[PDB]
Design a protein around this ligand. Sequence first.
Ligand SMILES: Nc1ncnc2c1ncn2[C@@H]1O[C@H](COP(=O)(O)OP(=O)(O)O)[C@@H](O)[C@H]1O
Ligand code: VO4
Ligand SMILES: [Mg+2]
Length: 705
Amino acid sequence: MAVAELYTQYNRVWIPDPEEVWKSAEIAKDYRVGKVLRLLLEDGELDYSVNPESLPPLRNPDILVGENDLTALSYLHEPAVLHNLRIRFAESKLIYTYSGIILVAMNPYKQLPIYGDAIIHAYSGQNMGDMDPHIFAVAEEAYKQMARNNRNQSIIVSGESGAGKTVSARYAMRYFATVSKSGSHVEDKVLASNPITEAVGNAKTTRNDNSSRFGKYTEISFDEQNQIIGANMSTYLLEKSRVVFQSENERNYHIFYQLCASAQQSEFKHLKLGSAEEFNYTRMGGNTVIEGVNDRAEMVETQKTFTLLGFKEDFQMDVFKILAAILHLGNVQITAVGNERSSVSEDDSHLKVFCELLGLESGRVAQWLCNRKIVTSSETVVKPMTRPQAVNARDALAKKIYAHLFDFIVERINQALQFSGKQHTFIGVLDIYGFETFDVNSFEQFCINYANEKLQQQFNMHVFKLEQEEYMKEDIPWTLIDFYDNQPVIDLIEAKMGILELLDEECLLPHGTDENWLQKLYNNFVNRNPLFEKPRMSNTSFVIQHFADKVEYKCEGFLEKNRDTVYDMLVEILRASKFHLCANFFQENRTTVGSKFRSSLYLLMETLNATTPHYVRCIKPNDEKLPFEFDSKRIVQQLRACGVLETIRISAQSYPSRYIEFYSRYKKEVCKVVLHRLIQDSNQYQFGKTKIFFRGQVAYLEKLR
Ligand SMILES: Nc1ncnc2c1ncn2[C@@H]1O[C@H](COP(=O)(O)OP(=O)(O)O)[C@@H](O)[C@H]1O
Ligand code: VO4
Ligand SMILES: [Mg+2]
C-alpha cells in the first residue's frame, strides 16, 4: 500500500553485514510496488534482492541523542534497537535506556559518577519517565507503588554472566537505603549484607572477576511509614566444587585470598597460613591475583563489614579458623600404597593444623580418609580406598564444611537484620547467577542455566501472557505480540520424564553411572526432542538449546554432584569436634541436589509472582571487560535471547492506565457516552467489557480535579 511510497530516493535502509550485523544503505531510485531495490552503499552500489512483502527495515531519522525510550522509535525493528543502543553507548556514554517500564542496562566496565547522593534525591519524588533512564528510577518507581498501593514489589535483574546484575541490584538497594533514611541505622546493615556474601559467595571466573556463585533474593521490609526496618536473605544453591577445584585463570572464593594475604599478620599467625600459592585449593588456576584488587585491603574491609553487622573479632576469627582449616585439609598428603590402597600419615603437618583448628583426633582422620566402613546387619566391613577415592572423600569433606559455613553466615546475617515491628510491605531484590558457558560445562552450569530459563519464563508469563490475556478477556481489539515460549526446554529439564528426573533415577541405582544416564538421555531425546542434541563427534556429552545459546554438557560427575555425600565416619569425626562452631555444623538435627533445587526455584517463582515486578535487563557489551566497547554480534544475540524487540513492541502497544471504579472515583453505556462526549479523542481511550483503557490520557483528567 503506502509502504512502497516510504522507500524513496534520499532514504536509508538496513541490510545484513557480517561484522556489525546490520549496515546502512541509501536508496538510489524510488521503489516500485512488486522484486529488487537499487541502493548506494557507503562504498558503491548494488541491486539489493528484496521480498515485496518484507522490504528492508526502514531507518529512523537521526536525532542529536538516542531517544531515552525505545518505544518512541517510529520504525520499530531489530536494526533500530541495535543502532539506538550503540549510539547511546559508544557516543553519549549512556548505559541506561528505557523499554517502557523495563530498563536496559549496558555494562560500562568503567566507574561512572552517576550514583551519588545528590542524584539519588533528584530521582526521589519524580515520576518514571520525567528523569533520564537510571537504575534509581526503576527503584523509585517500585518505592512509589509500594507506598501508594501497599503492594509488595520485586526488583528482578537479568542477563548473562558479567552483564552487571549484582552491580544493578546493589545500586537499587543503595537507593532504597538512602531515601528511607534517616530511620530513627538499620539501612547500613542491610547494605552490608551484600559485600559479606560476596566475600564468601563470589569468585573470579573467566567471564567475571567477581562472579556470583550463588543465587540471592533479599526481601527488604518496610513499616507503614515506608521506612526500612529490616531484611531477610534467601540464598540459592552455592557452587561447592569451587572450594576444591578451579580451571585455568579462575579463583576460589575471594575470602580465601583475603585470608592468605593476611597470613603474616599477628592476629592470623595461629592459623599457620602462607600465600595462596601454597595451598592446592587456591593455587589451581595458576593466578592468585585479580587485576585491580588488593586482597589484603579487601580483608580489612571485610572485617569492618562484619563489625558493622555486629560480628565482633571473636566471631570473625572463628570463621577464619574454619576457612584456614579447609585450606590445610587440601594440602594433607595422601600417598598411594600399591594399586588398591591409600595412606595418610598422622604426622602430616597440614593434617595436624587441620585437627588443631577443628579439635579432632589425627589418627581418626587419617584412618577414615583412606578407608570406608560398610555396616550390614550380619557384620561390619572395612574396605581400603584407592588414592583417587581418598582424594575425592577428602575434597567432599572440604566442600561440606564450606557449605555449612556459608549457610551459617547467611543465617546470622538474617538474625542481625530481624525486626520486632510488623512488616507492612516489602521490596524484594533478585540477584542470581546469570547464563554462562565455558569450554567445559558440567552440573554447575546446567543448574545455573536452568535457573535462568525459569526466570525468563517468569518474565514472559508476566510481560506477554498475563498482560495480553487481560486484554482478550476484557474484549478489546488487540493484535497479539509473539514471544518465544521457553516452556519446552524447561519441561525437558524439570518435568516428569525430564533430564533431572532421569538423573535422580540413575542416582538410586547402586551401580548407577554417568554413562548409563547419558545413554538414557540419548535414547529418550535424540531425534525426538528438537531441543536436545548429540554431537556427531562425542559419546560423552549432550547439547541443550537454551533461550540464549546452545550449551554442550559433559556427563562426567553428574551423579556424584547430584548426590553430594560425605562418608559417615568423616561426618561422625567432625560431629565430635571440640571446636564449638564446627560441632554445630555437623550436629544431628534423602532428596538430591537437583530435586532440592527445583523445589527452591518453584517457591521463588511464586514468591515473585505475588509481587509487582520491575525488570532490569543487563547486557554485557563485550567479552574483554573493555570500557564502552560495543560488540555488535554478541549484543544482538543477547537482545534476541531476552526478547527485547518483542518487549518494546508490546510496550509501545500497551495501555498504561486501566467501570465501577470509574463512576465512584470521579449503565456501562452511560459511563462510555459520558467520557466519549467528554474527550474529543476516541482513540485516546479504549473501552472494554468492564474497564476503560486510557492511552497518559488519564493524567489530564487528574489535574482537572
Ligand atoms: N554500572 C556499572 N558501573 C561500573 N562497572 C560496572 C557496572 N556494571 C558492571 N560493572 C563492572 O562489570 C563487573 C561485573 O558485574 P556484575 O554485576 O558483578 O556481573 P553479574 O551480572 O554476573 O552479577 C563489575 O564487577 C564491574 O567490574
Ligand atoms: O557472573 V554473574 O554469576 O554474578 O551472573
Ligand atoms: Mg553477580
